[PDB]
Amino acid sequence: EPAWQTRDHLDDPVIGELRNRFGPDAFTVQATRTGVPVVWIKREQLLEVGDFLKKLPKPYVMLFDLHGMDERLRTHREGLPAADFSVFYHLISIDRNRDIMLKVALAENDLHVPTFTKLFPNANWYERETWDLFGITFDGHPNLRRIMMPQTWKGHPLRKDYPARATEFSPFELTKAKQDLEMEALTFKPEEWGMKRGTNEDFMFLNLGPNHPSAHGAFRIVLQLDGEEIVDCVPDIGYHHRGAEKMGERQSWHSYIPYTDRIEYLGGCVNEMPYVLAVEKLAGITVPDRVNVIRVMLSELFRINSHLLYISTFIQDVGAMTPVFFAFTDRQKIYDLVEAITGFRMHPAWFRIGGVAHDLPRGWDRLLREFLDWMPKRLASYEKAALQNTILKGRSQGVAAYGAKEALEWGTTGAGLRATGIDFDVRKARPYSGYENFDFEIPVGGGVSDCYTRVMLKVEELRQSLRILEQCLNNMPEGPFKADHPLTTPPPKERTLQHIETLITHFLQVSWGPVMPANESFQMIEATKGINSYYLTSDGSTMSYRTRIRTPSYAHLQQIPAAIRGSLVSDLIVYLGSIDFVMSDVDR
Amino acid sequence: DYTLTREIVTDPLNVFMGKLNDMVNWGRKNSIWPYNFGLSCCYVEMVTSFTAVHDVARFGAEVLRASPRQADLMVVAGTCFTKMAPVIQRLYDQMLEPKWVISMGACANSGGMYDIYSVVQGVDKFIPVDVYIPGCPPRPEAYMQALMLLQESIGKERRPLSWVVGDQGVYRANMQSERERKRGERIAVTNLRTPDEI
Amino acid sequence: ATIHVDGKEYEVNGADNLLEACLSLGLDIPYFCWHPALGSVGACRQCAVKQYQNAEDTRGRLVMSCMTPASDGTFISIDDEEAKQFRESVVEWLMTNHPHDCPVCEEGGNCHLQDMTVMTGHSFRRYRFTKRTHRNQDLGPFISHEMNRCIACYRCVRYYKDYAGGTDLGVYGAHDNVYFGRPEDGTLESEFSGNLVEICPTGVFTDKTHSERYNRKWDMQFAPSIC
Amino acid sequence: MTLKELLVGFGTQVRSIWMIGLHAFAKRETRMYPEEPVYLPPRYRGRIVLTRDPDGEERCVACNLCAVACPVGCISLQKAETKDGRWYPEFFRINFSRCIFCGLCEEACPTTAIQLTPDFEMGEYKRQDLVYEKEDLLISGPGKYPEYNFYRMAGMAIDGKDKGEAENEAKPIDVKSLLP
Numbered sequence A: 001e002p003a004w005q006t007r008d009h010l011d012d013p014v015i016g017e018l019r020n021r022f023g024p025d026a027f028t029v030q031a032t033r034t035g036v037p038v039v040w041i042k043r044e045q046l047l048e049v050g051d052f053l054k055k056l057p058k059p060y061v062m063l064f065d066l067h068g069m070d071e072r073l074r075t076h077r078e079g080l081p082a083a084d085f086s087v088f089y090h091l092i093s094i095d096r097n098r099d100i101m102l103k104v105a106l107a108e109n110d111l112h113v114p115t116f117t118k119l120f121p122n123a124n125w126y127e128r129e130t131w132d133l134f135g136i137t138f139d140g141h142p143n144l145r146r147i148m149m150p151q152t153w154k155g156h157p158l159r160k161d162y163p164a165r166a167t168e169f170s171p172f173e174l175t176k177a178k179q180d181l182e183m184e185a186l187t188f189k190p191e192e193w194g195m196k197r198g199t200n201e202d203f204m205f206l207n208l209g210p211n212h213p214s215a216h217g218a219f220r221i222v223l224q225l226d227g228e229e230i231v232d233c234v235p236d237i238g239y240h241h242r243g244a245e246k247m248g249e250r251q252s253w254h255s256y257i258p259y260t261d262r263i264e265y266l267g268g269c270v271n272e273m274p275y276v277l278a279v280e281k282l283a284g285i286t287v288p289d290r291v292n293v294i295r296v297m298l299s300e301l302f303r304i305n306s307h308l309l310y311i312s313t314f315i316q317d318v319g320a321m322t323p324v325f326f327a328f329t330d331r332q333k334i335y336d337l338v339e340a341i342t343g344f345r346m347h348p349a350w351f352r353i354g355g356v357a358h359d360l361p362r363g364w365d366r367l368l369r370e371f372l373d374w375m376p377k378r379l380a381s382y383e384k385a386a387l388q389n390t391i392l393k394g395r396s397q398g399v400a401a402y403g404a405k406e407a408l409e410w411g412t413t414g415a416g417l418r419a420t421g422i423d424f425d426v427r428k429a430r431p432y433s434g435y436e437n438f439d440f441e442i443p444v445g446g447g448v449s450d451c452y453t454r455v456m457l458k459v460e461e462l463r464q465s466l467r468i469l470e471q472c473l474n475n476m477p478e479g480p481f482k483a484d485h486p487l488t489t490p491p492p493k494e495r496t497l498q499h500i501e502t503l504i505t506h507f508l509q510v511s512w513g514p515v516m517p518a519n520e521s522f523q524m525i526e527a528t529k530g531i532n533s534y535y536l537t538s539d540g541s542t543m544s545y546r547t548r549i550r551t552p553s554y555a556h557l558q559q560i561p562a563a564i565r566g567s568l569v570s571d572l573i574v575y576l577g578s579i580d581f582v583m584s585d586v587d588r
Numbered sequence B: 001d002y003t004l005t006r007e008i009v010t011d012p013l014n015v016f017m018g019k020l021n022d023m024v025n026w027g028r029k030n031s032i033w034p035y036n037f038g039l040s041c042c043y044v045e046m047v048t049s050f051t052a053v054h055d056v057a058r059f060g061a062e063v064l065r066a067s068p069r070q071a072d073l074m075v076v077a078g079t080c081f082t083k084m085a086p087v088i089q090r091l092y093d094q095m096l097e098p099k100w101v102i103s104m105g106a107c108a109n110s111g112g113m114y115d116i117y118s119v120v121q122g123v124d125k126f127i128p129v130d131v132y133i134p135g136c137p138p139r140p141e142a143y144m145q146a147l148m149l150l151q152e153s154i155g156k157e158r159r160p161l162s163w164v165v166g167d168q169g170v171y172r173a174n175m176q177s178e179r180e181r182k183r184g185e186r187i188a189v190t191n192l193r194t195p196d197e198i
Numbered sequence C: 001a002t003i004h005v006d007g008k009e010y011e012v013n014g015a016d017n018l019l020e021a022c023l024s025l026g027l028d029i030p031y032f033c034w035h036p037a038l039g040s041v042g043a044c045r046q047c048a049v050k051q052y053q054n055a056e057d058t059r060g061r062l063v064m065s066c067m068t069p070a071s072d073g074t075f076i077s078i079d080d081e082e083a084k085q086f087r088e089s090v091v092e093w094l095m096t097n098h099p100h101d102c103p104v105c106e107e108g109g110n111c112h113l114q115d116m117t118v119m120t121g122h123s124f125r126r127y128r129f130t131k132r133t134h135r136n137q138d139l140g141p142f143i144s145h146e147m148n149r150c151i152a153c154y155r156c157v158r159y160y161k162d163y164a165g166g167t168d169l170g171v172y173g174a175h176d177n178v179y180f181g182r183p184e185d186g187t188l189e190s191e192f193s194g195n196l197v198e199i200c201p202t203g204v205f206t207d208k209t210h211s212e213r214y215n216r217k218w219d220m221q222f223a224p225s226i227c
Numbered sequence D: 001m002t003l004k005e006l007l008v009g010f011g012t013q014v015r016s017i018w019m020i021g022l023h024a025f026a027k028r029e030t031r032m033y034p035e036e037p038v039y040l041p042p043r044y045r046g047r048i049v050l051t052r053d054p055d056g057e058e059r060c061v062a063c064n065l066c067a068v069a070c071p072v073g074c075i076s077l078q079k080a081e082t083k084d085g086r087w088y089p090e091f092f093r094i095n096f097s098r099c100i101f102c103g104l105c106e107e108a109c110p111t112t113a114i115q116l117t118p119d120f121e122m123g124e125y126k127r128q129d130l131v132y133e134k135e136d137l138l139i140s141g142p143g144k145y146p147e148y149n150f151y152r153m154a155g156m157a158i159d160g161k162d163k164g165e166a167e168n169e170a171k172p173i174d175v176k177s178l179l180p
């Protein structure tokens, strides 16, 4: 049985536990290609089911995702409850190495769900986004305001009747929004943002955006300050919302890949990987081994690129301005190899459904060998020049510390989670793309997630990626760069150029789009900044019915006030530099 | 051929006034201080151009002010999100004359691939642009090429030397388009390297 | 009538054949020579399904769904492995002589043969020999003729002669040199010859008036209107 | 703070200063654009051109696959036909202010007409001049694919290539022929 097969996951022990606790008729099990048990729960039992999963012997400790779906246009809903809308909850148990997707069906008039914030605190931002983009009200939410769109926005963009395209530009609306920008400092009410005690007669207020001179993007944080101490802070995000999920409903399966590139724009092929793996699950495609090794190589090259930028920008944020120049020289070496292979630097868009766009060009191994000889001495020089500096250590050690429980309750993934000692990397826990055939270690911390501990964990991850790249260079399989599946989009180009059936397949795949049969698929990967995931719903068409992108930077930015409360503002700058986020990842 | 702002007019250019205008234009085009403004991935390529492998400091364009008052150039390097558009307009209004604008990337040019509900379709809907860079992202040397194009445009514009004497109108050169300039050498291309090599 | 397709029970009209009954249920069976207005002839052999005699039957038999009545208590399989292989083989046989013409063919993106080639999952060519070719005819100002693209499904002659009552279109020749057209060059005399551009599943008969200012189907702006 | 911490920190600062000074004694990593030309690999995704077949005719058959495969929708063209019957673009315009240089059009092209070439220098003063018509795209040679010709594969008859003269084609047999 292939890994992309449609399964009900009725052999999962959590299904038997839920049946024993709530009864056989309390929920409906849906067969999907997501790889997780999908359980439709009644709305009135959602909090009970969440509590029961939270108090299991090996409990589901992390709310991985929470969002909505407009089911009104979905034609193939066989084996599903009646629903105009739905809300899904992706929960992960690390002790079981398992996950479950609960689903709540909602009528069109009765669009309200009980809030999940009393069980998982990251449900705050997730439910705010679900309210913003779908109009689903969450009862008991402390502040259910819009988080992507501005507060004076009409309609909910991810609804199926909302038009996706840009509206006509009006200078009057721009002038009005400028007037609100200038009057925001005067009409600031410290209760809409979820704060209390809005001036103890000494709590000043500070704004740190929305013009941020840094590579992570521009976003506002309004700070409540007692002298230099941060009493409270809420982040204002959505200034970089591109409507990428809505565009997922507006592009074919093949023509959406460049949009997957621009989610986490320092990631490139790492961003392409979960999307093409989930589409291949929908298509029933098993890629050959050479495709797996090529995609792993490009993912690790881009992981080293992103880690180099992250370490250099953190060192710059501490105050040492020199290593960023050399780190960008190393990034140029990586870009030489990536330009040679894919023809592009930052958004290669090179992965394909069923493989990659081209074969590896002749002579790529020379460039990879040159970079592998170049990198380690530069990395050691960066360590000795800046990362072992005691001024940098004093700026970074102990700043914005949290433990395993705080990382779990906020959905923190990546180096921030592993610095708490929790060994959870997707490349080992839930292997994908042939990562089992590589010998590499997963660095973990002692139990505390400082800025310095996160940075050193990312340095060790860079070294492990260099080891993976060395194994990629030494052991390259000889074979095809595209699968032999009929849904491989596009087909191999030479057969398109001389064979009529291949030409027909190419003609229909690039124009109308490849037809994915109606199913749901899910792929979770270890991205450069944490766990990235694509949840794709196909209604049987050439376009995605629903493209849900879970990004780790959203969770880390939401974790910020629980970790920085009671610190200084310079500590906030260092914490922002050590999170490893980009705002396109947050808003997307 | 010039464009007046206070009209398609002619060249207004004593021989000492022309030399003074040339000296002012030389000093302005050889000292261009960009505003440190990050919108999206195009900003990553711009600051890549600021690093050691490209060294945009060689053109005297590295100072990278965090204040709009001290900056002479605004590079819109990224998508003009509707929530960021009043911020962009306010930062442009806080800049002082003379000021120039470079749209970097398809998003800043026209909206790019993001013809979407939350994106303004190009920054020239609301602020005037001097140089456009196609690309997604443009490579760092494309940004340096646009910087040289801006230097060429600055080098033969006419602005008042003082605000108390003379014409206060700003004359901008109507350049020949780069497409029509490079058409002769671009169409003559016959063979390129095959994409199977490095 | 009650039929069982792939283990699922359906209620259908017993006067229908299996192909139109299954297409009315939303099932996808590839077909060429059948049309709803023309009836069934069993020529193209594309609509093969596996019919079983009873519910407890493993062997079955490949039958034409367009020629098989949807009688009560029928048992068939569309997604049977042998039936899928035969349908793919029929598409492959049609592709052996088909010209490399989709970019310069007015049927591209609106082609039934393209859709059924993709639907059967046939994208790999192992035929290496020559392809037969044909000269074209001048059919007048409305219909453009391109006999290379013909798959010999006989829908043009059936519509034009049996349905439309036309006399100047026919099938000529023999085994694999079957030619569909007029006995000589000239304008098609039927007042309903224009329906050939939708009846023909390939790009043999095309709209010449559209072909002057041609664009693909996905590029059109359509509206429901009255002639 | 501790005296040992102060001494270790002072030695660490001295080490950092020493390494940056030795960096000053090193080789420059700068590629001197524009005097040093930028090396671009042969498949670099820069300026888009339309190419010609080895006989000298333009390769584009106006099949509109590149336009529909474009995720930005920045390609517009219209099919025209010569008297011999070969298809060609009557016009072909690309909005380079919108183009994201993703290469999907070149991937979708069944004739290898449209190609992305190693040329990044495309800066412009006015956004209207970033709309490239066919006179700004069609180049004098085959580009990256030096020998492929779609019209030697197609069954459609054009000038200098009748029915049965394409690759893997047999001569047409009349139904009036005497052979059984």
Ligand SMILES: CCCCCCCCCCCCCCCCCC(=O)OC[C@H](COP(=O)(O)OCCN)OC(=O)CCCCCCCCCCCCCCCCC
Pocket: A388, D006, D007, D008, D009, D010, D011, D012, D013, D014, D015
């Ligand atoms: C107000 C200021 C008060 C404080 C300063 C007072 C004046 C100076 C008094 C003497 C200072 C001695 C400092 C300690 C030297 C020996 C220990 C040492 O170098 O510690 C720093 C660091 C320790 O290594 P570590 O960080 O643990 O890394 C792992 C490596 N095993 O090791 C390293 O980083 C590697 C070795 C670095 C050695 C640096 C040079 C030490 C001697 C400096 C002499 C004076 C220099 C003057 C300026 C020279 C440059 C222009």
Ligand SMILES: CCCCCCCCCCC1=C(C)C(=O)C(OC)=C(OC)C1=O
Pocket: B050, B051, B062, B063, B064
């Ligand atoms: C006109 C006199 C200039 C003196 C030096 C100015 C400050 C240093 C160079 C400018 C600069 C700043 C401020 C800077 O912050 C920075 O980091 C983002 C740079 O690297 C790209 C810089 O080049």
Ligand code: SF4
Pocket: A262, A265, B040, B041, B042, B043, B077, B078, B079, B104, B105, B106, B107, B108, B112, B135, B136, B137, B138, D100
């Ligand atoms: S043009 Fe492309 S690279 Fe530049 S900001 Fe837009 S998506 Fe990013």
Ligand code: SF4
Pocket: A504, C098, C099, C100, C101, C102, C105, C106, C107, C108, C109, C111, C112, C113, C114, C149, C201, C202, C203, C204
């Ligand atoms: S008839 Fe159909 S399959 Fe044949 S060339 Fe035309 S579009 Fe292609």
Ligand code: SF4
Pocket: C149, C150, C151, C152, C153, C154, C155, C156, C157, C180, C199, C200, C201, C202, C204, C205
């Ligand atoms: S010309 Fe068209 S309708 Fe007639 S037999 Fe051939 S493919 Fe069928």
Ligand code: SF4
Pocket: D069, D070, D071, D072, D073, D074, D075, D094, D098, D099, D100, D101, D102, D103, D104, D105, D106
């Ligand atoms: S490179 Fe991409 S965005 Fe540009 S014209 Fe081609 S398909 Fe469109």
Ligand code: SF4
Pocket: C103, D059, D060, D061, D062, D063, D064, D065, D066, D067, D077, D105, D108, D109, D110, D111, D112, D113, D114
């Ligand atoms: S895909 Fe190629 S042949 Fe077809 S219209 Fe575009 S450039 Fe012309």
Ligand code: FES
Pocket: C030, C031, C032, C033, C034, C041, C042, C043, C044, C045, C046, C047, C064, C065, C066, C067
């Ligand atoms: S459709 Fe039944 S044989 Fe042709």
